[PDB]
Design a protein around this ligand. Structure first.
Ligand SMILES: NC(=O)c1ccc[n+]([C@@H]2O[C@H](COP(=O)([O-])OP(=O)(O)OC[C@H]3O[C@@H](n4cnc5c(N)ncnc54)[C@H](O)[C@@H]3O)[C@@H](O)[C@H]2O)c1
Ligand SMILES: NC(=O)c1ccc[n+]([C@@H]2O[C@H](COP(=O)([O-])OP(=O)(O)OC[C@H]3O[C@@H](n4cnc5c(N)ncnc54)[C@H](O)[C@@H]3O)[C@@H](O)[C@H]2O)c1
Lengths: 254, 255
């Protein structure tokens, strides 16, 4: 017996080159980092966002579609166009999300409903159109949703303010991930979720200090801290992983 | 006869692991041997601690087997002294050793119960303790990866068979130890995470496999290779900001 061992070197380009990534909220802080990361491994990326991207990517593999994921008419038209052009996504990333910052006792129905519509309806709508398309085509697509530490833990009001509706909708996204994972599994479709901890953006160093005190790894996150888990959950590295919520938070929610 | 083997290596992981030394308890077992082979293929150095000899000759001077019993403090102490003496300070500790027993709860003896506790709980505790103390002293930003189970999260259905109370107890204990040590060791830059596999295809009956696959959304039992991606994820810079987590790799079984 002579055993010959051969080492085939591969890159995340080999995973993602020429794959098509549909990302809602791709113009935002986390979304832009994911767009740039996928483009750098030769993926095609479609961004759905009412806001123009922050940078000119200067790339024939990038497309921005100005769209509002709370609007079924707009999303329906986009998916007709995608199907008509045979731009069938391999990966859907439901990154779009919003919040509101006044106290519970002052929450208006307009505030509450807007957070529900972006976070819950938007993730439902994109997942519904994408699931139906993949089912029609037999595509073994992958969905990645975005939760939050505040869909698992409860925000400390003394640290500042995260509202009740954000906790509600992020807990709902985490559970919808499990629901659609079980529902879509017979079609070969995987569905997981990433819940980031606090990402450094425009917070007062009063909040930052209080936040870092609760974080074992002793710092706030950056968008780059999420890319590895995003790639993990949307690549062949996680073929047997579905229905999971992955907390990337430096140990905040331990 | 000639036998050709093809190992797909991710450059990110070869570049990442080529200077790493991985200490894996239970590395001779079904999952452990797959992890040893995978780490060797991305140029890591691997030390396997196991009372049983590996069943494969890896034919690599980057591999070392140490015959060892992780329930024996004196044995582990002397091994860790030798590792320090030889400049073999691990970068990654994988607590993969684990056992179970299969008679019914009402027939569990204390010898059975205590043996499962000692391998699963004492062994993970002891190896984590010697490794933590050494890293803290050397200032090494090591990574620990523990092994839970779906049955430390969910509860076994005995109509599918034998999975015992003490396995559920100790795997839940390892999952929570992961969170404890993650918080405890974080000030020293040490990360601690856990992987909980679903059931792995081996020598089960065809009736068992049918019943198991029926509970699994992805419609199949696991294979050791299904775990390598998450093992690599949690022991590489791709997870720098991830600590204290239990990652279920189970095809949706717990849903
Ligand atoms: N930033 C953090 O600290 C943090 C922490 C945990 C979770 N998250 C979550 O991560 C995801 C991304 O957050 P971010 O920090 O990049 O936010 P951001 O505010 O920088 O980006 C959100 C993006 O969503 C887009 N968007 C808003 N409404 C939309 C709509 N109706 N249709 C389509 N797009 C819409 C916005 O235009 C924006 O580009 C969100 O789900 C958020 O809840 C963020
Ligand atoms: N195999 C599965 O279906 C499955 C599912 C979930 C979790 N797990 C867990 O995954 C890990 C590996 O499981 P496996 O299926 O490869 O098991 P296995 O029985 O094939 O291997 C276990 C290894 O641990 C070693 N070991 C036993 N006692 C030891 C001791 N005192 N000191 C050092 N090593 C010792 C054994 O010699 C063996 O090589 C275990 O923790 C197990 O509980 C396995």
């Amino acid at each position: 017996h002579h055993h010959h061992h051969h080492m085939i070197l591969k890159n995340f380009s080999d995973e993602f080159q020429d794959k098509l990534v549909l990302i809602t909220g791709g113009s935002g802080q986390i979304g832009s980092e994911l767009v740039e990361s996928y483009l750098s491994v030769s993926a095609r990326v479609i961004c759905l966002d009412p806001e123009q991207p922050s940078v000119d990517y200067k790339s024939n593999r990038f497309e921005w579609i100005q769209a509002d994921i709370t609007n079924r008419k707009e999303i329906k038209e986009i998916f007709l166009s995608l199907e008509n052009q045979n731009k069938i996504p391999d990966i859907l990333i439901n990154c779009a999300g919003i919040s509101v910052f006044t106290p519970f006792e002052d929450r208006t129905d307009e505030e509450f409903n807007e957070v529900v519509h972006v976070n819950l309806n938007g993730t439902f709508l994109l997942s519904q159109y994408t699931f139906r398309l993949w089912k029609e085509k037999g595509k073994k697509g992958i969905i990645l949703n975005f939760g939050s530490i505040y869909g698992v833990s409860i925000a400390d009001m003394r640290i500042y303010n995260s509202p009740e509706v954000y906790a509600m909708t992020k807990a709902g996204i985490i559970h919808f991930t499990k629901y659609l994972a079980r529902y879509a599994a017979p079609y070969g479709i995987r569905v997981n979720c990433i819940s980031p901890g606090g990402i450094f953006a425009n917070q007062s160093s009063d909040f930052i200090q209080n936040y870092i005190y609760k974080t074992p790894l002793g710092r706030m996150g950056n968008p780059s801290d999420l890319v590895g888990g995003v790639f993990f959950l949307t690549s062949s590295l996680s073929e047997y992983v579905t229905g999971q919520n992955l907390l990337i938070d430096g140990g905040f929610t331990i």
